[PDB]
Structure formats: structure tokens, C-alpha cells
Amino acid sequence: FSGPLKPMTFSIYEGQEPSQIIFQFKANPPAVTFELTGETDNIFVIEREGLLYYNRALDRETRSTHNLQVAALDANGIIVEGPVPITIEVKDINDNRPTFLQSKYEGSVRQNSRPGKPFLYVNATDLDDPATPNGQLYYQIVIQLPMINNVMYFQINNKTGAISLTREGSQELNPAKNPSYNLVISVKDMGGQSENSFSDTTSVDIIVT
Amino acid sequence: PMTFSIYEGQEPSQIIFQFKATFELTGETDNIFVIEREGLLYYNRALDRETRSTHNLQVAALVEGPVPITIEVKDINDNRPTFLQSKYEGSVRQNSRPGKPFLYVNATDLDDPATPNGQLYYQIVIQLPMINNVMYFQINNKTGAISLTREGSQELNPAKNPSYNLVISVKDMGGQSENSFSDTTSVDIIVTEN
Ligand SMILES: [Ca+2]
Ligand SMILES: [Ca+2]
Ligand SMILES: [Ca+2]
Ligand SMILES: [Ca+2]
Ligand SMILES: [Ca+2]
Ligand SMILES: [Ca+2]
């Protein structure tokens, strides 16, 4: 938990209240005191003894990296050593629900449209880290109304939110029989893979032409 | 003490983690997980959730550990759902209440049932005989509970036709086409008198 002044990177989970110092910098005479600059945000502090710490739980969605610099000073306040870059990587936790860009979508599809060919897109946004499951979204049709004998007329690309006819929907959609369908779409984060995830829903009304 | 979540059925394309200190790895390594002498931790071929879903590893410094390193093996759809029977023999009373089950068909899926990979969707593929394209039978697409329709309750008549065959399908990925496996099974149903 101590060592020379040099470029270093520390990884700290957002939402963790501090319990111990991050690091102690040691610098031989003529290193008197230490100075901390950069994206301190009144969170990151260095003491005279070279003790580096953070004073409150971070939030990746306020700042996802804190670019700091540490320098060793002498008696006259004059830089002796560094300034060196000290990087804080604020590790993501799943603390944001995914939200649909619309609570209601209005679409239309032609009667004999190709199966798999998109005619509408639903999208959601998640403020968590997209390089992690926390920010990786999975789209599902949860309801089709009306639905005949459990045959799905519509399918959604689970990654992209692209809504297209199924094989059966291509074959069966007939505006005279039924001019419109309502889909309820879910989105989950954690890539749709957990129970331990957040979810949103939207409604899509679709006219058959 | 760290957790890493690695999909099964992927050839390693990245290291798991570089520890900064000599390191020893112990625990459920299964000659797949390796740590270099200087703490580069990595896996040397594709995991299989259905062989081992968590790998409980320990990393020690040589003094500092051992620490539990947990590998959560994330599921992919690599198992077809299967019915518990290839043939079911059912019986339903004439005028039985619509929607009241009289038979269950079941499937199991070796993939994770907390994911779409293990999430099954039951359908009636075909009712024989069928009159005028009217379904006498319905199935609960979550449970595989088979019951009469309103039409079936009103029409089934063992004097006119005492037996029907259903072909039932089960799909995983919650029954959507793309990336899903499927099984089918036969149900013979006798209609008894009221
Ligand atoms: Ca946050
Ligand atoms: Ca999220
Ligand atoms: Ca977050
Ligand atoms: Ca497997
Ligand atoms: Ca499966
Ligand atoms: Ca699997």
C-alpha cells in the first residue's frame, strides 16, 4: 500500500464508501510534501505524508475516470519529482435501469412483407457501462394481441430492437381479417441473462396495409 | 477476491486478468485455467456451463493469498429441449369446461432456465381430425397444459369422433424462431361420454 512516485492506475467500484487509503507515496529528501492536481472533484485528496485517499463513494455516471497528477515538492513549494499521472478507473455497477426512447411506437407493415425484414426499430438507453453486462440490453416481445393459436406473427432482433414478420406472420397477415396488432416489448440489461437485472417495457401498435 | 463472468462455447480471445505482486493457481482449474509465474490469468479453451457452471479458483502470491477467484460460466443456447415422453395418451370428458387442463406435456432443457436458452414455449402444431379450421384444443404456451377450447367443449362427441391426435412442439428462446431449438411429440386423446 506504499511505494515510489510513478505513473499508477487504481480501479475503484462506484457505490463503495471509502474504508482505507488508496496508496502512500514515499519520496526521499529533498521530497518534503506532496501535491495532487487534476480531476480531484473534492473527492481525491493527498496528505503531506503522501497518503492518497477518496472521501466519498464515486459514481461512474458522474465521472468514469479521474485523471489525477501527483508531484513531490520541497520547502519553497517548488516541484522536485513528477508531476506523474495517477489514473482512477471507476468500475461500473448495475445502478441504472434501461429506458425505451418512446413509451408508444406507431408502425405499419405490408401484407406479404418478407419474414425477417425490419419495418420498425425500438431502442432503449442504459446509462451503465456498455462494455459490461450492466449496460448490455436484450429485447423481447412479451405480448402479441391478438394472437391466434400461440402463433407469433412478429419477431424482434434481441440485440438491435429490429421488428420484422415471422414466416407465419408473412403468410397470415391480412388487413381484412385483422387490421392491427399491439406488441409489448421488454428490454433487460445484464444482456437479458439475469434475473438480477433491470427492465423496461414499451407498447408498439402496428397497422397491416 | 474477484468474480469473472465468461461465456461458455467461446475460444479464449482475451486474458481474464493480470495480477501485480510469483503466483500460484489452485482450485477447479480443470487444466483450462492457468496463471503465468507473474500473475497473467487466462483460460486455454472453451468452457461448458453444462459440465461446470462455476469454477472456484484460488490465487496466492509467493504470502498474500489464497484468495477466491470465482469464474461464473455464462450460458449459451447449446441444448435442444426434449419432451419427457415421445407419445402421450390423454382422455377428456365430453363437455369438459373450456380452459380446464385434462393433460400436461412437459419438456426439459439442459441450458439455464433463468435465461431465454432454457425458456420453453409450447404450441399445437396440428389437430387431427379438424373441422372447418376450428381448434377444439388449446395449450398453455408456458406450462404445456392442454384443455378444450369453447368450440371443443361444445362439439367434442365420442359418438361422432371419439379420438384426436395433437402434434405438440416446444421451442426454447421463449419460442421465437431465431437461434432456437425445438422438439415435437404426439398426443392421442380419447373423448369419454357425458
Ligand atoms: Ca452510478
Ligand atoms: Ca443497467
Ligand atoms: Ca453504473
Ligand atoms: Ca454447454
Ligand atoms: Ca436450450
Ligand atoms: Ca448451455
From Swiss-Prot, chain A:
Glycosylation sites: N123, N158
Role of this protein: Cadherins are calcium-dependent cell adhesion proteins. They preferentially interact with themselves in a homophilic manner in connecting cells; cadherins may thus contribute to the sorting of heterogeneous cell types. LI-cadherin may have a role in the morphological organization of liver and intestine. Involved in intestinal peptide transport.
GO molecular function: beta-catenin binding; cadherin binding; calcium ion binding; integrin binding; proton-dependent oligopeptide secondary active transmembrane transporter activity
Shown chain mapped onto the complete sequence: 27 to 235 of 832
Tissue expression summary: Expressed in the gastrointestinal tract and pancreatic duct. Not detected in kidney, lung, liver, brain, adrenal gland and skin.
UniProt keyword Transport present: yes
Any one GO cellular component localisation term in the record: plasma membrane
Record remark on domains: Three calcium ions are usually bound at the interface of each cadherin domain and rigidify the connections, imparting a strong curvature to the full-length ectodomain.
Protein encoded by which gene: CDH17
Subcellular location: Cell membrane
Residue stretches making up the Cadherin domain: 4-102, 103-209
Highest taxon of the lineage: Eukaryota
Protein name, per record: Cadherin-17
Gene Ontology process terms (BP): adherens junction organization; calcium-dependent cell-cell adhesion via plasma membrane cell adhesion molecules; cell adhesion; cell migration; cell morphogenesis; cell-cell adhesion mediated by cadherin; cell-cell junction assembly; germinal center B cell differentiation
Annotated keywords: Calcium, Cell adhesion, Cell membrane, Glycoprotein, Membrane, Metal-binding, Repeat, Signal, Transmembrane, Transmembrane helix, Transport
Protein's organism: Homo sapiens
First-listed, main subcellular location of the protein, grouped into a coarse class: membrane
Curated annotation (Swiss-Prot), chain B:
Keywords from the UniProt entry: Calcium, Cell adhesion, Cell membrane, Glycoprotein, Membrane, Metal-binding, Repeat, Signal, Transmembrane, Transmembrane helix, Transport
Subcellular location: Cell membrane
Molecular function per GO: beta-catenin binding; cadherin binding; calcium ion binding; integrin binding; proton-dependent oligopeptide secondary active transmembrane transporter activity
Ranges where the Cadherin domain occurs: 1-85, 86-194
Domain of life of the organism encoding this protein: Eukaryota
GO BP terms in the entry: adherens junction organization; calcium-dependent cell-cell adhesion via plasma membrane cell adhesion molecules; cell adhesion; cell migration; cell morphogenesis; cell-cell adhesion mediated by cadherin; cell-cell junction assembly; germinal center B cell differentiation
Tissue specificity remark: Expressed in the gastrointestinal tract and pancreatic duct. Not detected in kidney, lung, liver, brain, adrenal gland and skin.
GO cellular component, one term: basolateral plasma membrane
Glycosylation: residue positions: N106, N141
Domain remark in the UniProt entry: Three calcium ions are usually bound at the interface of each cadherin domain and rigidify the connections, imparting a strong curvature to the full-length ectodomain.
Purpose of the protein: Cadherins are calcium-dependent cell adhesion proteins. They preferentially interact with themselves in a homophilic manner in connecting cells; cadherins may thus contribute to the sorting of heterogeneous cell types. LI-cadherin may have a role in the morphological organization of liver and intestine. Involved in intestinal peptide transport.
Record's protein name: Cadherin-17
Natural source organism: Homo sapiens (Human)
